[PDB]
Amino acid sequence: PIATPYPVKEWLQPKRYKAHLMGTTYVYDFPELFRQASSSQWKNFSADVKLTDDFFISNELIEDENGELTEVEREPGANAIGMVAFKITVKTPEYPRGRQFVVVANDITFKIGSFGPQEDEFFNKVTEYARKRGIPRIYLAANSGARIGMAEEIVPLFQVAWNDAANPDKGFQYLYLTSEGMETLKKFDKENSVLTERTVINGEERFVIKTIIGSEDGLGVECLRGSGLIAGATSRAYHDIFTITLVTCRSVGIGAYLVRLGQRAIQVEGQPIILTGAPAINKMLGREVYTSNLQLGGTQIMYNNGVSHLTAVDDLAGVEKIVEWMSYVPAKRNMPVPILETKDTWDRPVDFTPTNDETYDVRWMIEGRETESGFEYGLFDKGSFFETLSGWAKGVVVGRARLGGIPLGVIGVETRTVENLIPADPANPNSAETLIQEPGQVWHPNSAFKTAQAINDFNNGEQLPMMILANWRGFSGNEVLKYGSFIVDALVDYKQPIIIYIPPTGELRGGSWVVVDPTINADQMEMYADVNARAGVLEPQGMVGIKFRREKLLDTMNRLELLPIYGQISLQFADLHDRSSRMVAKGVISKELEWTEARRFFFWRLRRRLNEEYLIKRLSHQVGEASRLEKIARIRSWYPASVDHEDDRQVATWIEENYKTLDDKLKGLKLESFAQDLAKKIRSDHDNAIDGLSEVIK
Amino acid sequence: ATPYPVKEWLQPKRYKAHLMGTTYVYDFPELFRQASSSQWKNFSADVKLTDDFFISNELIEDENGELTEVEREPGANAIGMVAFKITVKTPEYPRGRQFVVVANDITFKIGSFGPQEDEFFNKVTEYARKRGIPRIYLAANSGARIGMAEEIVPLFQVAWNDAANPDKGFQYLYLTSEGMETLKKFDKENSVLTERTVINGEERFVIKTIIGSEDGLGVECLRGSGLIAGATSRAYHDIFTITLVTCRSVGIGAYLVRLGQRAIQVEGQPIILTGAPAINKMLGREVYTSNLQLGGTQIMYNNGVSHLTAVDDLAGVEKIVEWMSYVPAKRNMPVPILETKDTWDRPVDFTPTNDETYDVRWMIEGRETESGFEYGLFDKGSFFETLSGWAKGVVVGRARLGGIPLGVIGVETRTVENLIPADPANPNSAETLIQEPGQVWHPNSAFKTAQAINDFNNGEQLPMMILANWRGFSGNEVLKYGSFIVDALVDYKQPIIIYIPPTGELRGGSWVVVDPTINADQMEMYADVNARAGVLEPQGMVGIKFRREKLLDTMNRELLPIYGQISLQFADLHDRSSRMVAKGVISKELEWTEARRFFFWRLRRRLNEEYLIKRLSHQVGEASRLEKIARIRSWYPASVDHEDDRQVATWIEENYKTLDDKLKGLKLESFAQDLAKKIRSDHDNAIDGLSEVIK
Ligand SMILES: C[C@@H](Oc1ccc(Oc2ccc(Cl)cc2Cl)cc1)C(=O)O
């Protein structure tokens, strides 16, 4: 454009234009998008808030001469490699004083954002940078995969020693180099560019090419090593810090791999996630099977399969989802989860209530429900429910929510039936659509997998507490065995409080109960049942057909056709066994609750548990054989005698008032152990031991 | 009576178990005795065993509920679950190895899991885990025990509506002042939760909840199921776990075979979540005739849940014992070395050729030929394949290298005819014959590969070799499972060897999932001189950096056909192991024929160095793995070539006890070095403790 109000950004830096032509945001413009999203964050939390410019800081990161990452301020487009990173520092509602994270991204304008050894090495450095600091790592993927290429400085030299020079059609023997060809290389210092041997044929002194290496780096296997390196780096990152990646422009090969390795992924519509391009897949098979890469890695495929947790209409939408997602996550590894009080106070009843009659959306029980006669509040803070993996295995609902300001992961069960449709396969004319009915409250391979993925995703990086509104009465698919197994493993590994709650009108039968029982992880799990909930190995019908058969159904029909009404009797006899009262009597749940009062009970129970967990975790690197079980008992023996250990609000309150003081008792607890240990060491090797102490003078 | 004197009280127990199609619980230890004896026979026919080579002591809880060995009469179990502590002398552990066998007693309440069975099982699992010994589970059960208050059955009343004739309906269930009292004389008064409600002269106790006096009716059984499901999950990561499905395994029973991962299914014995009769009552028509269509070996062995299949119980027990022969006697002990006739010093005979099909197993274990026997890479007769009925594109099993046990993963070059049967649940759907090309990763082969790596790593604690030979991938799913492989590599705690074999290739994404840098602490890459590797293969590489123009440009030498081959070659000259060495992506290129020799000493050397590193586990202070190996190697004599595997291994084995003395010194060093740093970080605190300690 000629003569515009302000400078033409796309002209000052043509790369910005090239990026837009690619249909994605120019890399150096992303920090700005995070500013806008953070600003929006505030505008939704408290509109009367006036942000200044120093509320958001973005410092590009590059490697210095020693290869160490350092902050710099240069002009966009100065990057010498196709990978860049920024260290962001933002003041946010949950972290007013500020929080940090790293943003690594491919520069789609630098060799089509390909991964070369330097890009790989940079990405690895940045990832390690974030991990050492316990800081989140955001990856913006816009690439073309591993960089490729041959040694061009060898194309105008290699000679072809044919069988008979006068018969090229008869084939050839091998490729060699002349004495002149060798001199060309020696002139460019590119001597060790190829491996060769000297052989004199019919007179001339030849140099057979054994192997072609190349002076240019990033031609083959070194790109593969680099890819393996960052793949491993990302696998580790996921277990260390919060990871998430946004696909803004295609993401290919190692690019797609990283998307999955970081687990949490948001896909912008139209930007495919592919291992290999459709063109390549065509040439291979036979004819033109696929018309677009969107048929291979498009949203309708990755979001539907669960690779993509969320979809975004554009780059800004994606960044906004990243930021909203981060608002439930600790500023950094091992910090308490970020409390964020909203207008919706903890002290209120739960309005929306399920009815054995009318069908409902679990989300209503979760986040509340908007109606004509007004809004009906749900179990968690209004507007705090952030659903993820919503395009996959809809039989189960997954997301983050807030309880009186306390963030946590929530897993619910969709009661309505799902109509998972699967498009035909382009690589087989003999195949049509396939509508699959997925019954509610039943566990299918996908539901189980999604359930396991959620637990692991709440646990790793996010380090959140969790509540599962357990309401399953079966399983039918036999891979289910494998994925169900993933659930137990996921729970065994959970490190923050877990709450399992069978809601009103809900039930948990046989296998369904098994996979979520508190004993799987007694260190963190507690189970509760609504007074209007049902639970048992078998449902009434099943129990009847085994313990109340026509045989005995007659004996009672005597002491008192009339089969139907007597069938309804047997059912009630059974159903009277599946009550929460029996659950309390048998000791399988911590408590039976009343739905309307659950928001109040859980807020304090969870708050109390988070406070206690925090004290326990202070004894992690304690010396000795002390068990978690013995650690809480000890800590709890500290509470004032007049404090009721079963009064959640009271225990939470006292702890919150004595942090510093408790740290002291904790410190003194480890000190006793360190001494008791040194004692047992001397009383197990007095010789070398005693001498050791002596070796310690000053 | 009978020819020989046998326990009379067992007859009916045995009969019932057999009626179920399984061996009687107490006769199982005998099968283990036979398999072990048979183990010695195959190893050294000229061996005479004394009964003391095998001991089996039943395990039961004492007064304090603690598990103790007992010498009691068989068939005396008061619960439907039993266990044995077995001590046996085996070829790999001549002085003896131990493990526990936990099993359902199919004759005790049809092998259902009740609270007591559950807690016992859990206690036995924990018993093994605390000792680091293998836990074998023999499944023969009916799932969670189920019940109902049978005492409330005879004495419960109905309160009908406007019906002196029930036909209309009822309002609730109640108890009479007498029935209520009946429970009082039986002491089963708290078997219900009622409310006093005198209506029409007569008082009725409304039934609000039925508890029952018999333990093990509902949810208490579910808690128990959850307890052992989790206990098994932990065991799998702690000790060697394996399960033999010797009869039906239902619900929690089925779940357990999975949770323990390694599983052997006896033919005709199904692993199911819920029976067929049950499923039919949830679909309308009679769709399933038998549970075998739900959990038979055709399902579970093909799906990957069952690692192996067995014709009968004893075959299963033999497979378990055979499997165990590759595993340490207990957690963290060195892998069991078992040298046989086939020693390490010999070249590898069998060699794959470009123009000829081959079974990767020939490369692994060797092949029988009319002229004799072509030895493969590993010890003749040592290959033990598992998960052979699922994802045939990848080959996994245990093997021995000059006596050293390890996990092996190879790539099936021949295509696979995957036949997926049609489920009766949908008549509209018939069977299909999926086509799986070799050297191509698919969702299932990727999944199987990750499982293999994790199963070699957890419990087995085995080193591993992957004869990487993949190119493309097709079947989305691939993405998720491919990532499982990386996670498994990252988690691997023993030496790993990635080796691209002769005629083998590794391209693009296939290289990245097995690159050494994923876990530099344990991985090493090797490429045969006749191997190939690059991002793309010649075909595609040319279709990007050598098109019509460049191809027609390099005419300084209309003959498209012949020149097309010249370009491909120009490319192929890049994919050489020599470049791989030049670029530094492999530790070195090797010659197939000498691989056995080379790998034997490299592994032996690595195993030795690992052991030395492990001795610095509890070493206080914080030193990186690379920091410990560096100091360990600084101890080698200055004349030892750190690159000479045999020499390094030889010196170490000659100095175990010496290195051990030096090893301790390095600990006591840090011991005080730590106390010092303590004071130099909290002087006040330290002094008080130092003083208080000196007393
Ligand atoms: C009460 C029930 O026990 C179980 C326990 C685990 C079961 O396995 C699963 C449970 C849940 C899921 Cl999602 C998957 C599986 Cl394989 C099935 C039944 C039984 O014994 O019948």
Ligand SMILES: C[C@@H](Oc1ccc(Oc2ccc(Cl)cc2Cl)cc1)C(=O)O
């Ligand atoms: C070199 C190659 O990089 C990769 C990396 C990972 C890839 O994804 C996988 C490869 C193998 C497996 Cl088993 C799984 C995945 Cl997800 C694909 C290509 C590329 O960039 O094309």
